[PDB]
Design a protein around this ligand. Structure first.
Ligand SMILES: Cc1cc2nc3c(=O)[nH]c(=O)nc-3n(C[C@H](O)[C@H](O)[C@H](O)COP(=O)(O)O)c2cc1C
Ligand code: SF4
Ligand code: SF4
Ligand code: SF4
Ligand code: SF4
Ligand code: FES
Ligand code: FES
Lengths: 66, 41, 54, 212, 230, 430, 59
């Protein structure tokens, strides 16, 4: 109420712990006591694209611009 | 032969290219289609 | 300074008229230059003694 | 050269613009040449028809071509802003292209540039305070083997000199048009010495061939 | 059974047929730096950044659009690969204006990060530096078209996801203005998703425009509303 | 083997250079067209390909890819997708008039050759792309197509046998890039002229997705003559890799600048002076010689007095042979100014696909401006050397490469005029 | 080159020299700079709040 800042009563608000595997993450979280929510890893899906398919003859995949 | 066998080019008017494309439109095999009539149909 | 602008920032003349030196100035002061992984140690002679840094 | 439209009416659709049904039959011949399934390939010949009908194309012409070829207009705007033969500025009857790059400038095009400049009056790249003298200097056209060259509406002029400049410009003022071919004799692209080409009447299919 | 042998600097790995060099290099972890390729769109090649010296070839070729013959070896850390990256990164920063303070992608540039980690340091090209004046695309998307590196990513996004076909290249040589020719305020769906496509600071958010620069703001997981897909 | 080769009469592949006896299919029959071609066509396209590789046709237009390998790639078995033949007829490399002469004085042998190429590889229709600068010559081509149709011998069921073959003509709209190999293909497609990526070849995906190819007009002109004439009669003029006749033209600085057919090799001094008038001011007046046109490095005086005019010879001279502007230029012109105007041409015509040619021709245009005004340092001329090493081959097409090579030739040969120009600018400012 | 008062500058007969480009708060080793930025009705990007903590400022 004097400067327009965001104070907090949260010492733990600026923790982050970058790990390398989900197993050690869950093991450390269960080791140190508190609860935890696991979200699963999502890779980009591999696709099938080609420039010749962008220059189709009777397929509708057509670049239409260039 | 040292005589300019052209001047057959000389009479060319500004419509003659589209005129020749117009008149030579027959015996045209159907320029093969592909699915839709257009990229957006 | 070193003549490796991807570590030390350039000076003002090239900074106000370059492009690579302005980019290097900008990102070098925002992010900080990347440092390859590994653990090093060194130590020099502080007037106390072995000032070591790991 | 101001590649954004910025309407300025005598533009600003709808400018009233329409063709001739004979030109519509030209349009149907043009999109009857190309195969079915790829109608969008005749954009440049239809836009060439629009330029040959009305000497420069307005934006309503591009909307018209887009509605005829049932395409979005943006491809027509790309093709209009991309090439060289299509001048979106309004021009006059005759259009002067003074071509000068590698044999043309190195065979002294600057005399021709000075002659055109101090005969016509308006500066290079600009237009004239009448019609029929929109002057631009241009890059290579292909017809290189002679003096630096002048293209007017589908015609060439080679082997120039400032008295030929005076003659051709005064006769385009009069309206009588000279030949597209070369000057100073040499009625084609010729070796202009002692006729170092072929002289005998060629035999052709008569003499020794094989597997025919 | 449909495998291809490549060596990534000796490390062998297997490649499905028809795919690119770049997907296998990203399979082994090597992010070859890219500017025009993006996986939600088709493959242009107009940014030239992904050059890599593939062996027994005097010419250095692109990696976003190379068919993968059997038995390659891909030299990413060679000499002339680095020399080509130095050259291309020096070419990009020539006609790019000194706007990194007044840009809105200070923390999130691509020229800045990749020109630190891959480019030269002492610049050249003393005079010159042409500028393209901006347009008015939409009141939701602030647009400066001098910073456009003409990378042809928004164009492919339009013609292949938006289907609107209002953005195009105009001109030749150095002079390629990218946009809509006819003073039309481009308004369509997913036009807010073009400020995340544009890799350089040439298409930014209009209402956000000048409130923060993204190292201060912390990033937090949440779930969407107002659509049933999230 | 010939002693460096020259023109022997009636060994000209095509007569009627200009304005000769008539301009008609009857004149084509008198000059050697429509003679016994059906017996050539009905033997099998493998024999035509054997005839062409017997002649050993080097590909024209200044590329180097031979016609036999290309049209042997064109022997794909026919699927449901048709095959197309595209006859390219633009004239880049300013200084050209290569096929302007051919399409102005003899379209009939081009009709012969496109019929031969359509039979020889399974092609079905031939699109002929003329430059947009050539309305009158295009209408002459239309009159010749009307004559060939009105004979009732092409179009549908050609040569009397059941073999239809249609030919169309598409105008240009003015470009250098539409002459190239694949921007041609997409310029026919109605999209704006922009090259594709090469490892999908035109012989696999082409005009909208069909196995097509693109032939130069000189290849189309020479093609029925090799079919109607003997094997390797063409190949007896010059060396073994390159073989046959070529248009060597001086479009530039000589007295009577003109065009001559010659064989594959020639002594260059005989070529320049003993056929086309004389050099303007004598043999010792010229500063240098450019072969090829505009995509070729220069050749100075002490190199041009000795080097013969072969493709392998100009590979040995680190250049590339093209057409029709094998010209000299005088000391009275500044070659810095000439090459700078050529770089301005390169900026004015180039598409904007690839980043490096775009920005490299941008820097080279502004830097050659600063060299004509002379306002730089020698580190700048070596920087221009470094960027010309950087650009080359790192693009799609060869316009960036053909912008790299003249800078290379100027730096390899004419350093001292640059140094004296910069020293005179130092004397001017100081 | 003493380091004292933390003053601002401005253009010759012109507006505020700052752009609010957040470099000083990105480098401030006790984070005493606090910048909240907004553009005004003109269009040039500017600020709202530019605070220096004199306690945290190590100079
Ligand atoms: C930079 C460049 C410019 C070209 N200019 C022309 C041209 O003006 N006219 C043309 O017919 N072909 C032109 N071409 C294409 C070449 O002539 C090419 O060799 C042709 O497609 C096939 O010729 P070839 O089969 O006889 O080798 C150009 C190609 C490149 C790379
Ligand atoms: S506006 Fe952005 S995304 Fe579009 S071409 Fe330019 S730099 Fe690329
Ligand atoms: S996009 Fe351009 S102006 Fe913006 S931060 Fe990057 S280099 Fe600077
Ligand atoms: S090198 Fe230049 S002109 Fe050639 S395809 Fe690439 S962008 Fe176009
Ligand atoms: S935000 Fe800080 S670094 Fe940027 S202009 Fe303002 S005072 Fe300078
Ligand atoms: S340069 Fe003038 S015509 Fe080719
Ligand atoms: S990523 Fe391959 S060229 Fe842009």
């Amino acid at each position: 109420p004097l400067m327009g800042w965001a104070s907090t009563a949260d010492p733990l608000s600026n923790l982050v712990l970058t790990f390398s595997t989900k197993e050690d993450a869950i093991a450390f979280a269960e080791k140190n006591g508190w609860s935890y929510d696991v979200e699963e890893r999502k890779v980009p899906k591999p696709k099938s694209k080609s420039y010749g398919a962008n220059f189709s003859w009777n397929k509708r995949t057509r670049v239409s611009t260039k | 032969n040292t005589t300019y066998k052209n001047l057959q080019h000389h009479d060319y008017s500004t419509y003659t290219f589209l005129d020749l494309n117009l008149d030579l439109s027959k015996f045209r095999m159907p320029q093969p289609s592909s699915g839709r009539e257009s990229p957006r149909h | 300074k070193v003549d490796d602008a991807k570590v030390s920032p350039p000076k003002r003349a090239e900074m106000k008229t370059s492009m690579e030196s302005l980019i290097h100035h900008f990102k070098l002061y925002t992010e900080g230059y990347q440092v390859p992984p590994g653990a090093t140690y060194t130590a020099i002679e502080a007037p106390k003694g072995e000032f070591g840094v790991y | 050269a101001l590649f954004v439209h910025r309407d300025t009416p005598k533009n600003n659709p709808e400018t009233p613009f329409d063709f001739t049904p004979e030109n519509y039959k030209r349009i149907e011949a043009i999109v009857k040449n190309y195969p079915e399934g790829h109608k969008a390939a005749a954009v440049l010949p239809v836009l060439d028809l629009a330029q040959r009908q009305n000497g420069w194309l307005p934006i309503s012409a591009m909307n018209k071509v887009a509605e005829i070829l049932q395409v979005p207009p943006m491809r027509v705007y790309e093709v209009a802003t991309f090439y060289t033969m299509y001048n979106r500025k309004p021009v006059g009857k005759y259009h002067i292209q003074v071509c000068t790059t590698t044999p043309c400038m190195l065979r002294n095009s600057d005399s021709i540039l000075e002659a055109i400049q101090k005969k016509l009056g308006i500066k290079v790249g600009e237009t004239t305070p009448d019609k029929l003298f929109t002057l631009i200097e241009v890059e290579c056209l292909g017809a290189c083997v002679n003096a630096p060259m002048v293209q007017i509406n589908d015609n060439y002029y080679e082997d120039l000199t400032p008295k030929d400049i005076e003659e051709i410009i005064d006769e385009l003022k009069a309206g009588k048009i000279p030949k597209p071919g070369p000057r100073s004799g040499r009625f084609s692209c010729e070796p202009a010495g002692g006729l170092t080409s072929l002289t005998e009447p060629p035999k052709g299919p008569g003499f020794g061939v094989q597997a025919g | 059974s449909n495998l291809i042998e490549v060596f990534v600097d000796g490390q062998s790995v297997m490649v499905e047929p028809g795919t690119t060099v770049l997907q296998a290099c990203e399979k082994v972890g090597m992010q070859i730096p890219r500017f025009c390729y993006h996986e939600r769109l088709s493959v242009a090649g107009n940014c030239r950044m992904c050059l890599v010296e593939i062996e027994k070839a005097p010419k250095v070729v692109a990696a976003c659009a190379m068919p993968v013959m059997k038995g390659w070896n891909i030299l990413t850390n060679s000499e002339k690969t680095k020399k080509a990256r130095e050259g291309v990164m020096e070419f990009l920063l020539a006609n790019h204006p000194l706007d990194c303070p007044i840009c809105d992608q200070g923390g999130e540039c691509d020229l800045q990060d990749q020109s630190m980690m891959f480019g030269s340091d002492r610049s050249r090209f003393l005079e010159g530096k042409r500028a393209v004046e901006d347009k008015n695309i939409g009141p939701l998307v602030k647009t400066i078209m001098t910073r456009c590196i003409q990378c042809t990513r928004c164009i492919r996004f339009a013609s292949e996801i938006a289907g609107v076909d209002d953005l195009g290249t105009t001109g030749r040589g150095n002079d390629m203005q990218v946009g809509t020719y006819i003073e039309k305020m481009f308004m369509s769906e997913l036009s807010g998703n073009i400020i995340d496509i544009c890799p350089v600071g040439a298409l930014t958010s209009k209402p956000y425009a000048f409130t923060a620069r993204p190292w201060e703001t912390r990033k937090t997981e949440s779930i969407d509303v107002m659509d049933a897909v999230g | 083997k010939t002693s460096f080769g020259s023109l022997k009469d009636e060994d000209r592949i095509f007569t009627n250079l200009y304005g000769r006896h008539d301009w008609r299919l009857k004149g084509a029959q008198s000059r050697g067209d429509w003679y016994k071609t059906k017996e050539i066509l009905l033997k099998g396209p493998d024999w035509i390909l054997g005839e062409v590789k017997t002649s050993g046709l080097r590909g024209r237009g200044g590329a180097g890819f031979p016609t036999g390998l290309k049209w042997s790639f064109m022997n794909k078995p026919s699927d449901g997708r048709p095959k197309y033949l595209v006859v390219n007829a633009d004239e880049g490399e300013p200084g050209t008039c290569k096929d302007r002469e051919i399409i102005r004085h003899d379209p009939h042998k081009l009709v012969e050759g496109c019929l031969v190429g359509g039979r020889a590889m399974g092609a079905r229709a031939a699109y002929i792309y003329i430059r947009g600068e050539f309305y009158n010559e295009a209408s002459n081509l239309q009159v010749a197509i009307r004559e060939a149709y009105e004979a009732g011998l092409i179009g549908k069921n050609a040569c009397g046998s059941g073999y239809d073959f249609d030919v169309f003509v598409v105008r240009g709209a003015g470009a250098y890039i539409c002459g190239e190999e694949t921007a041609l293909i997409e310029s026919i497609e109605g999209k704006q002229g922009k090259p594709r990526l090469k490892p999908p070849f035109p012989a696999d995906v082409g005009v909208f997705g069909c196995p097509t190819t693109v032939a130069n007009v000189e290849t189309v002109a020479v093609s029925p003559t090799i079919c109607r004439r003997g094997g390797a009669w063409f190949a007896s003029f010059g060396r073994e890799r390159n073989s046959g006749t070529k248009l060597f033209n001086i479009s530039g600085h000589v007295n009577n600048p003109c065009t001559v057919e010659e064989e594959m090799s020639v002594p260059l001094k005989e070529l320049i002076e003993k056929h086309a008038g004389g050099v303007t001011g004598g043999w010792d007046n010229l500063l240098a010689v450019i072969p090829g046109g505009s995509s070729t490095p220069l050749i100075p005086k002490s190199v041009c007095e000795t080097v013969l005019m072969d493709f392998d010879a100009l590979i040995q001279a680190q250049t590339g042979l093209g057409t029709a502007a094998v010209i000299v230029m005088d000391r009275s012109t500044d070659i810095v100014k000439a090459i700078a105007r050529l770089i301005e041409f390169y900026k004015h015509e180039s598409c904007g696909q690839c980043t490096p040619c775009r920005e490299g021709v941008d820097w080279m245009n502004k830097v050659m401006a600063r060299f004509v005004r002379g306002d730089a340092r020698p580190a700048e001329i070596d920087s221009l050397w470094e960027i010309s090493k950087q650009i080359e081959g790192h693009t799609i097409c060869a316009l960036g490469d053909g912008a790299a090579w003249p800078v290379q030739g100027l730096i390899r040969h004419f350093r001292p005029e640059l140094e004296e120009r910069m020293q005179r600018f130092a004397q001017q400012h100081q | 080159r003493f380091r004292g008062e933390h003053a601002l500058r401005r253009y010759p007969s012109g507006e505020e020299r700052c752009i609010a480009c957040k470099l000083c708060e990105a480098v401030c080793p006790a984070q005493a700079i606090t910048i909240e930025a907004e553009p005004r009705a003109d269009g040039s990007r500017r600020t709202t709040r530019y605070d220096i903590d004199m306690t945290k400022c190590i100079y």
